[PDB]
Amino acid sequence: KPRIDMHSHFFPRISEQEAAKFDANHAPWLQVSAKGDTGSIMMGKNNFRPVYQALWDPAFRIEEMDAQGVDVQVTCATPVMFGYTWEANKAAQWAERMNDFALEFAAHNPQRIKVLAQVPLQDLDLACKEASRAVAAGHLGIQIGNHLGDKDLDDATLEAFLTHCANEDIPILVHPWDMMGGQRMKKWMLPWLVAMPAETQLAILSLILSGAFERIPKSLKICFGYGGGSFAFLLGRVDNAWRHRDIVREDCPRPPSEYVDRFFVDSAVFNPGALELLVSVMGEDRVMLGSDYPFPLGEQKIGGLVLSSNLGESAKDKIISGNASKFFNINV
Amino acid sequence: KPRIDMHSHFFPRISEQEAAKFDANHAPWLQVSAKGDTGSIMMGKNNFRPVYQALWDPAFRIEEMDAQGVDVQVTCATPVMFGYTWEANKAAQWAERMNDFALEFAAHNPQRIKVLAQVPLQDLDLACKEASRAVAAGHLGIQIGNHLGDKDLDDATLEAFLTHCANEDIPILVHPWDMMGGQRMKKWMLPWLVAMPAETQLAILSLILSGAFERIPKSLKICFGYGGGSFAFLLGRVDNAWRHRDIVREDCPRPPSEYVDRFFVDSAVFNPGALELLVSVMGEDRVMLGSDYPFPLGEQKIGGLVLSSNLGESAKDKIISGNASKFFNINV
Ligand SMILES: [Co+2]
Ligand SMILES: [Co+2]
């Protein structure tokens, strides 16, 4: 059985002065130490995140997959590369540059490294073009942020994008980014612990309660990061509301929990009971191993949590291999 | 066996002028309709929120209690009553009558109807003043908003307040209000499904990761509303972050999951699996039955989820009744 990890990120070699050529405050670039082993994602002139080789260097990444026992890894852009706020033609350009970088990275060993495209989502026309092009060019689908400022997934532009992908049999992974919280969550990585899972839950819900899933064709393949946030756990609150308020029910014809057959989630929930509640709510067919490699708060032993749970033989196979094979049409 | 509902709310009978004497524009009052079965919480001259009778009628509440088999019920201010933005010294008094009004509602019957108080939390001194006098007066503890603007519970000022309450041996129910989200959660009661649980989780993690518990004594009896939100579901992720980053660990000397013996949660989670997972995280002694009566999104069949679960019979007894009596001081 081949182990598949479908949530991992990369960042290419981009010089400071080139990030500038797009935007001197918000275009990210990669400062690497001369040692070669480490560096940081930068932002204008500011440190954004400490990183290490496996992020940019595909050769190095292979050992680490050998070491982890990971055969096939589907990887994508680091969310900070998204460029969703920017002027649209630069973002469309930026995306095309990055999705090419990504193809290269994978070319090192295209059998074992698969990529996902980023798109200039603030512009529906350019975004569908990049989606279609980049999948022509090798990508197995797209990764988008869960929202566009105060447009959430129920917005018509975002729905139309999912609908473009649906119609072209292009899979989508949705990653939270640009977290709500303004000024309250500056210490202890709260943005990662509180805002992020709520962000993701809210992507799922914006689609459910807006009646979006009645409009998007049933053939869409859409997956949600980090177990779909707290979605599964708060699903009962959601149904309850739905049953007792017209305003909650107005746009959503079926109970919200009936819609769990319309998307997938990854496995990264960091706890045996959570994963089980998750697989319980979602079904063993809709969960995929993702690790969030190679970041500090990803699963440092990939598959560990699944490999050693109270779970089905076939279910574990589905989660570590089966599900993702189909979702991404990876020839097992 | 005597069922206790420790999460409910009231609004008082304040005459517009006898209210506006505080703020002609922002002090909330209650308008009682034609028949007498329906109302509206009014803001100065504005229609804020319509309301059914049991929010204001103690005599009527009793009948509904008897109909549910609730023997004792603890009720607190509706979040609109808070006024944590308001000029301290004014609210210091405004809180006082809110709390006297409360006692006035709990006068009709004290064996069965119990009160917690609100405070002018924006000024520490006035709030500490008020809590003590209000408890002395006959309130059983207090209810606070989870946050005050950008000021979360890791605040030395808030922390101080809680340490005060532990020392005077006063219990505290934490409720989420004034939800994060800016312009984003506008339909389908999204703030209540997403913002609310995130907020409650934020409040709990604020104490844990800030180190607040290594400075606040074991004597604080603090409960968090709505099952602690998504806290118990996401605990796995926090322990993982903590293990993997210095900034998560920097102020919290022990793994976050160990602090689960320093607080309580109510049980309003509206799902069998969620409840068991939550008791699995918190234990039978730290989960109390709360309905959120009389709001529509409260539990209809009060106690139903607990009584309908595969849990230890005496565990059931503790949620329903045992724990709350100890926690609040309710004669069995
Ligand atoms: Co990620
Ligand atoms: Co409430």
Put simply, whether A271 touches B (Cβ < 8 Å) is yes
B199: tokens are: 């907020």
Q: Which residues of A21-45 are buried (b: 16+ CB within 10 A; e: fewer)?
A: ebbeeebbbbebeeeeeebbbbbee
- Residue to test with chain B: of A49, A237, A248, A276, most B Cβ within 10 A: A237
Q: How far apart are CA A113 and CA B51, in angstroms?
A: 58
- In contact, B74 and B6? CB cutoff 8 Å: yes
Chain B contacts in chain A segment 175-194 (CB below 8 A): 180-185, 187-190, 192-194
Cβ-based contacts of A200 with chain B (< 8 Å)? none
B169: tokens are: 């041996």
List, as one string, the DSSP characters of A132-183.
HHHHHTT---EEEES-BTTB-TTSHHHHHHHHHHHHTT--EEEE--S-S-TT
Task: List Cβ neighbours of B293 (8 Å cut-off, separation of 6 or more).
Answer: B5, B7, B8, B9, B54, B64, B73, B75, B299, B302
> Which DSSP helix (H) or strand (E) runs through A277?
helix A272-282
Put simply, whether A201 touches B (Cβ < 8 Å) is yes
- In contact, A187 and A181? CB cutoff 8 Å: no
Experimental technique for the deposited model = X-ray
Cβ-based contacts of A247 with chain B (< 8 Å)? 187-189
Resolution number, Å: 2.4
Q: How far apart are CA B285 and CA B178, in angstroms?
A: 30
CATH number at residue A301: 3.20.20.140
CA dihedral A152, A154, A160, A164 (to 10 degrees): 90
Q: How far apart are CA A74 and CA A83, in angstroms?
A: 22
- Chain B: give the shortest CA distance to residue A306, in Å: 14
Which residue of chain B is at minimal alpha-carbon distance from A151?
A: B184
Contact A193 B241 (CB under 8 A): yes
H, E, C per residue of chain B? CCCEEEEEEECCCCCHHHHHCCCCCCCEEEEECCCCCEEEEEECCEEEEEEEHHHCCHHHHHHHHHHHCCCEEEEEECHHHCCCCCCHHHHHHHHHHHHHHHHHHCCCCCCCEEECECCCCCCHHHHHHHHHHHHHHCCCCEEEECCECCECCCCHHHHHHHHHHHHCCCCEEEECCCCCCCCCCCCCCHHHHHHHHHHHHHHHHHHHHHCHHHCCCCCCCEEECHHHCCHHHHHHHHHHHHHHCHHHHCCCCCCHHHHHHCCEEECCCCCHHHHHHHHHHHCHHHEECCCCECCCCCCCCCCHHHHCCCCCHHHHHHHHHHHHHHHHCCCC
Report DSSP state, residue A9: E
B295 CA distance to ligand 2 middle (Å): 8
B177 CA distance to ligand 2 middle (Å): 9
What is the count of structural domains for chain B? 1
**How buried is residue B82: exposed, middle or buried, by Cβ count under 10 Å (0-12/13-18/19+)?**
buried
Full domain range(s) for residue B194: 1-332
